[PDB]
Amino acid sequence: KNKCVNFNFNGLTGTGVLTESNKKFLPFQQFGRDIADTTDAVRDPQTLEILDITPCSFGGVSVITPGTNTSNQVAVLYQDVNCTEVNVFQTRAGCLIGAEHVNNSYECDIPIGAGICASYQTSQSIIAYTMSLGAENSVAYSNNSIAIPTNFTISVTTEILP
Amino acid sequence: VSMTKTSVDCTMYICGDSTECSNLLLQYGSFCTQLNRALTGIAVEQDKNTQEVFAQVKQIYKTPPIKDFGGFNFSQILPDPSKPSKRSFIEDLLFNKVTLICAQKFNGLTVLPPLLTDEMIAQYTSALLAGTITSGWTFGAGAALQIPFAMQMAYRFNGIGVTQNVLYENQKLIANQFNSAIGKIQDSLSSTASALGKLQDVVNQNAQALNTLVKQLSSNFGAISSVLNDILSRLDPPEAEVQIDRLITGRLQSLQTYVTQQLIRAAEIRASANLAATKMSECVLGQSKRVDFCGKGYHLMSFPQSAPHGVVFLHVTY
Amino acid sequence: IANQFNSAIGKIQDSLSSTASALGKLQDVVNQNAQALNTLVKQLSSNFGAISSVLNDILSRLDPPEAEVQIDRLITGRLQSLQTYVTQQLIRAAEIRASANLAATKMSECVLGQSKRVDFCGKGYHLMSFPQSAPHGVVFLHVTYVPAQEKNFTTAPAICHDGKAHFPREGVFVSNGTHWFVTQRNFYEPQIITTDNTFVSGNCDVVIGIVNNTVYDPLQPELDS
Amino acid sequence: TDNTFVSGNCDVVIGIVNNTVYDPLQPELDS
Numbered sequence: 001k002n003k004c005v006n007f008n009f010n011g012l013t014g015t016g017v018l019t020e021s022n023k024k025f026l027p028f029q030q031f032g033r034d035i036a037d038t039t040d041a042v043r044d045p046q047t048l049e050i051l052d053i054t055p056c057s058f059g060g061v062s063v064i065t066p067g068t069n070t071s072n073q074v075a076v077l078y079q080d081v082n083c084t085e086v087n088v089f090q091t092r093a094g095c096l097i098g099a100e101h102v103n104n105s106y107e108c109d110i111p112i113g114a115g116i117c118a119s120y121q122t123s124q125s126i127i128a129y130t131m132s133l134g135a136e137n138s139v140a141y142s143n144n145s146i147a148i149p150t151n152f153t154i155s156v157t158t159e160i161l162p
Numbered sequence: 163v164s165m166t167k168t169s170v171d172c173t174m175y176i177c178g179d180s181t182e183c184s185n186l187l188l189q190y191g192s193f194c195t196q197l198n199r200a201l202t203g204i205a206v207e208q209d210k211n212t213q214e215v216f217a218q219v220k221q222i223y224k225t226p227p228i229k230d231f232g233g234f235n236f237s238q239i240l241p242d243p244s245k246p247s248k249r250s251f252i253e254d255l256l257f258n259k260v261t262l263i264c265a266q267k268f269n270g271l272t273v274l275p276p277l278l279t280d281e282m283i284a285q286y287t288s289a290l291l292a293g294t295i296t297s298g299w300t301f302g303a304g305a306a307l308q309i310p311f312a313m314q315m316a317y318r319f320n321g322i323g324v325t326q327n328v329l330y331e332n333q334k335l336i337a338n339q340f341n342s343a344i345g346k347i348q349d350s351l352s353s354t355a356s357a358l359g360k361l362q363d364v365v366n367q368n369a370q371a372l373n374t375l376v377k378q379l380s381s382n383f384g385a386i387s388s389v390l391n392d393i394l395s396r397l398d399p400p401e402a403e404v405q406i407d408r409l410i411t412g413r414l415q416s417l418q419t420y421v422t423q424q425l426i427r428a429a430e431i432r433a434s435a436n437l438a439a440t441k442m443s444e445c446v447l448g449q450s451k452r453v454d455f456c457g458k459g460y461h462l463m464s465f466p467q468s469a470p471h472g473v474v475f476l477h478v479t480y
Numbered sequence: 481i482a483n484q485f486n487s488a489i490g491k492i493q494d495s496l497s498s499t500a501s502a503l504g505k506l507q508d509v510v511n512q513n514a515q516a517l518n519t520l521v522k523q524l525s526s527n528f529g530a531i532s533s534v535l536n537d538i539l540s541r542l543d544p545p546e547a548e549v550q551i552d553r554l555i556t557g558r559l560q561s562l563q564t565y566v567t568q569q570l571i572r573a574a575e576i577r578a579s580a581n582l583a584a585t586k587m588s589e590c591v592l593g594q595s596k597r598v599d600f601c602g603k604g605y606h607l608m609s610f611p612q613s614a615p616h617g618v619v620f621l622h623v624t625y626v627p628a629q630e631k632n633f634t635t636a637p638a639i640c641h642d643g644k645a646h647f648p649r650e651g652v653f654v655s656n657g658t659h660w661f662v663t664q665r666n667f668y669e670p671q672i673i674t675t676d677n678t679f680v681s682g683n684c685d686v687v688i689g690i691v692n693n694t695v696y697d698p699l700q701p702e703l704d705s
Numbered sequence: 706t707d708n709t710f711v712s713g714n715c716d717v718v719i720g721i722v723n724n725t726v727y728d729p730l731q732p733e734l735d736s
């Protein structure tokens with residue numbers, strides 16, 4: 001149980017992780033299925049038990065690296081899984097290795113997810129930091145207080161559309 | 163604004179846990195590699211949509227400790243720090259009225275989390291709401307400029323043709339008209355759940371397409387069986403490759419049908435995302451001299467509200 | 481404004497030449513097509529389940545009735561590759577046509593005319609826009625009005641003089657600690673409060689925040705003439 | 706006169722009516 005294995009039960013075969021849950025099959029129903037008619041649980045042909053079938057651990061491999069002109073350092077990201085295979089750190093999107101978690105939040109550089117961005121900084125490596133939304137600005141407010149510009153700046157912005 | 167990010171693996175979906183079947187999939191070349199890049203570009207554009215819409219400013223504007231609303235009641239639109247997650251009382255209803263995925267994401271597809279969390283998206287709206295209450299019309303086009311909210315409704319009448327003398331005299335009567343308008347919205351969203359159905363349709367559109375793609379694995383697609391290992395056991399390896407080829411071809415048509423819809427639905431969302439980016443620019447940030455772009459009535463100032471996989475606009479109109 | 485504008489144009493010429501990632505918006509469109517063109521061409525090297533991906537190899541080996549079975553495997557895979565390409569190109573064109581409508585909209589509203597809509601022509605209050613030819617697209621140079629220096633000013637919604645409230649015809653009320661002034665919203669230009677810049681509406685007992693002051697009347701000094 | 710502007714004459718515009726426009730300069734000269 002609780003491991004990735006190739007199981008063959010009665011005339012049913014499959015591959016996944018067997019875990020006993022609190023589900024209860026009808027005494028005349030050996031096999032369960034999901035909405036897609038894929039088996040999510042089985043009953044052992046010998047002993048009477050309810051074993052939920054969870055598929056084996058898998059996910060996406062997200063390679064986080066600066067450009068070839070910058071550095072060869074790479075931060076490997078796994079999706080929707082904790083650290084299993086494997087500076088091994090965990091994030092909200094999954095197990096993220098190769099990057100260092102930083103409490104100080106900076107401007108987003110390489111997008112990851114769940115409000116996490118990566119960058120190559122300081123003896124320099126890749127760091128995994130919380131995405132900053134910009135500098136906090138507290139604007140004072142009052143009945144008689146007002147800000148009228150005493151000077152202006154003409155700036156030409158470049159918009160590019162295909 | 164944001165559509166559910168889904169990255170489907172064509173290696174696992176087409177051929178479940180089969181190397182010999184994967185050899186038949188390699189006979190089709192980049193079809194697998196190409197379908198992955200199409201869904202990947204969707205997940206990237208949905209993250210670009212939230213950046214081009216939710217955040218119109220590079221600074222976080224917050225409300226002062228002393229809150230002077232000019233007679234209005236902004237406690238509904240402004241976030242509450244007492245809650246563990248920062249959100250407005252209205253956005254709290256927006257998260258609840260908008261709601262298996264765990265079973266399908268174990269079938270060889272992956273639902274990617276958004277780049278901006280709901281707490282960060284709410285701070286974008288918190289920066290826009292606190293700005294319009296304090297900085298008003300200035301902060302959209304440049305640095306924030308503090309202006310009293312009692313005077314922030316004065317020029318907005320001057321833009322729609324009403325002389326601002328009406329505001330200062332009727333400000334007491336407008337305080338009752340605005341506060342009652344906000345209260346009717348909270349009762350409308352809480353009691354009636356069909357107002358947010360526009361976002362529920364987007365989630366139902368994705369959930370139906372996700373369920374549609376997964377239910378196709380149980381189909382025969384002309385093959386004798388729907389199980390790869392069962393075909394390999396009942397038939398010889400050369401005779402099984404003919405039956406497996408019918409499954410692969412049928413399952414590729416399932417992805418090519420799903421990816422086609424997602425690319426088309428993304429352009430539908432990007433069409434609405436560009437409107438949300440345009441409305442927040444014209445309605446929320448500035449004043450709209452246009453008619454019925456910000457909704458019925460002469461536009462004054464708009465209130466953005468964070469919502470799951472989208473955004474809710476509150477347009478104050480005259 | 482000459483020193484501000486002429487230097488702003490040079491900053492873009494220095495940003496485009498030194499930094500090549502500013503044009504990545506158009507570079508992605510060309511790369512999106514090349515990745516679609518290369519993918520479509522690489523499919524002819526894939527066997528698509530057939531013994532080989534070369535037509536001359538299948539025709540020279542299997543019988544004409546036997547070759548049609550394998551050629552059916554190629555064309556079916558080549559149709560699915562071409563239909564997928566055309567499917568994407570129709571979808572990619574919809575992205576380009578949607579941006580072309582914005583390009584046609586900004587060319588009229590930003591470039592040709594003047595758009596009051598905020599941040600449609602870019603950050604700042606739009607003045608005029610300068611179109612520039614670019615490969616498979618267009619580059620817009622938007623002249624904008626961005627306020628820079630500001631200062632905390634004492635303001636009031638109204639001025640109480642004869643017992644009736646005075647409201648600005650254009651601009652807002654400000655005070656520097658000496659006398660109440662009427663200045664433009666985007667520019668601070670101290671001006672003496674007069675009956676020409678204000679209009680009389682209501683009284684001093686209604687408006688919340690009205691202050692006592694004296695409004696200059698140009699008719700009074702002329703009474704000596 | 707501060708709320709109006711003089712353009713043309715009374716013999717052209719259709720719908721023009723006869724009335725008295727208050728002139729604030731008049732009472733200040735006599736007083």
Ligand SMILES: *[C@@H]1O[C@H](CO)[C@@H](O[C@@H]2O[C@H](CO)[C@@H](O)[C@H](O)[C@H]2NC(C)=O)[C@H](O)[C@H]1NC(C)=O
Nearest residue numbers: 137138139140141142145146308630631632633
């Ligand atoms: C007045 O102008 C200042 C210019 O910085 C505004 O900024 C404040 O500056 C004071 C200086 O002691 C700080 O203590 C405040 O924290 C600043 N506030 C913010 C949000 O930047 C200030 O807001 C303006 N208004 C006031 C209250 O005078």
Ligand SMILES: *[C@@H]1O[C@H](CO)[C@@H](O[C@@H]2O[C@H](CO)[C@@H](O)[C@H](O)[C@H]2NC(C)=O)[C@H](O)[C@H]1NC(C)=O
Nearest residue numbers: 140141142143144145226227228229230231689
């Ligand atoms: C706007 O005016 C109100 C009323 O004068 C100010 O509120 C007062 O603040 C002071 C000083 O702390 C208190 O002693 C009073 O009790 C408050 N009165 C009322 C009616 O609330 C308010 O502070 C002024 N503007 C801001 C934002 O400070």
Ligand SMILES: *[C@@H]1O[C@H](CO)[C@@H](O[C@@H]2O[C@H](CO)[C@@H](O)[C@H](O)[C@H]2NC(C)=O)[C@H](O)[C@H]1NC(C)=O
Nearest residue numbers: 229230231232233234235236237238251341345
């Ligand atoms: C704005 O509306 C809110 C609604 O929650 C008011 O907060 C409470 O409203 C209830 C009535 O629904 C009162 O019984 C409470 O005494 C109010 N206070 C609290 C702390 O709950 C709020 O007072 C209204 N006014 C403002 C300016 O926020």
Ligand SMILES: *[C@@H]1O[C@H](CO)[C@@H](O[C@@H]2O[C@H](CO)[C@@H](O)[C@H](O)[C@H]2NC(C)=O)[C@H](O)[C@H]1NC(C)=O
Nearest residue numbers: 150151152153154481482483484485487628629
């Ligand atoms: C307003 O700001 C502008 C800059 O945006 C100021 O222009 C600069 O003035 C200084 C004064 O020493 C010169 O050294 C700079 O070369 C000027 N720069 C430009 C771009 O001209 C301007 O002086 C400020 N004051 C006013 C009234 O505009």
Ligand SMILES: *[C@@H]1O[C@H](CO)[C@@H](O[C@@H]2O[C@H](CO)[C@@H](O)[C@H](O)[C@H]2NC(C)=O)[C@H](O)[C@H]1NC(C)=O
Nearest residue numbers: 634654655656657658659660661669670671672
């Ligand atoms: C605020 O504005 C007033 C009016 O412009 C300034 O008063 C002038 O100050 C200058 C320089 O001291 C004098 O030469 C003028 O004669 C003053 N005019 C009047 C009518 O008072 C004042 O200096 C400004 N600054 C302050 C301290 O408020």
Ligand SMILES: *[C@@H]1O[C@H](CO)[C@@H](O[C@@H]2O[C@H](CO)[C@@H](O)[C@H](O)[C@H]2NC(C)=O)[C@H](O)[C@H]1NC(C)=O
Nearest residue numbers: 640641642643644683684685689690691692693
């Ligand atoms: C502005 O002037 C008015 C008078 O024109 C002031 O109102 C008076 O207040 C006093 C008490 O201080 C009363 O005895 C008078 O009867 C009031 N007169 C009127 C017209 O109501 C008002 O207080 C002044 N405001 C300021 C801030 O100076």
Ligand SMILES: *[C@@H]1O[C@H](CO)[C@@H](O[C@@H]2O[C@H](CO)[C@@H](O)[C@H](O)[C@H]2NC(C)=O)[C@H](O)[C@H]1NC(C)=O
Nearest residue numbers: 713714715716717718719720721722723724725
């Ligand atoms: C204004 O009243 C006059 C009559 O007092 C109307 O007719 C004018 O009469 C005078 C002679 O008293 C003629 O010289 C004019 O030619 C007449 N016409 C006008 C327009 O001057 C006149 O029609 C009335 N106008 C309006 C629009 O009420």
Ligand SMILES: *[C@@H]1O[C@H](CO)[C@@H](O)[C@H](O)[C@H]1NC(C)=O
Nearest residue numbers: 027043044045046047048049
């Ligand atoms: C089968 O054999 C096992 C041996 O332990 C026994 O415990 C069980 O009761 C037998 N009957 C069933 C239910 O298979």
Ligand SMILES: *[C@@H]1O[C@H](CO)[C@@H](O)[C@H](O)[C@H]1NC(C)=O
Nearest residue numbers: 067068069070071498499500
């Ligand atoms: C890498 O990029 C930097 C900055 O553009 C440049 O100065 C440097 O010469 C580049 N190096 C190479 C090998 O291209």
Ligand SMILES: *[C@@H]1O[C@H](CO)[C@@H](O)[C@H](O)[C@H]1NC(C)=O
Nearest residue numbers: 057079080081082083084090
């Ligand atoms: C990851 O660890 C968390 C915290 O211990 C646990 O709640 C969760 O079930 C784990 N998930 C996986 C995929 O192991």
Ligand SMILES: *[C@@H]1O[C@H](CO)[C@@H](O)[C@H](O)[C@H]1NC(C)=O
Nearest residue numbers: 100101102103104127128129
């Ligand atoms: C982040 O904060 C945690 C909790 O205080 C602390 O244990 C850790 O050392 C900090 N890490 C960094 C990089 O500052």
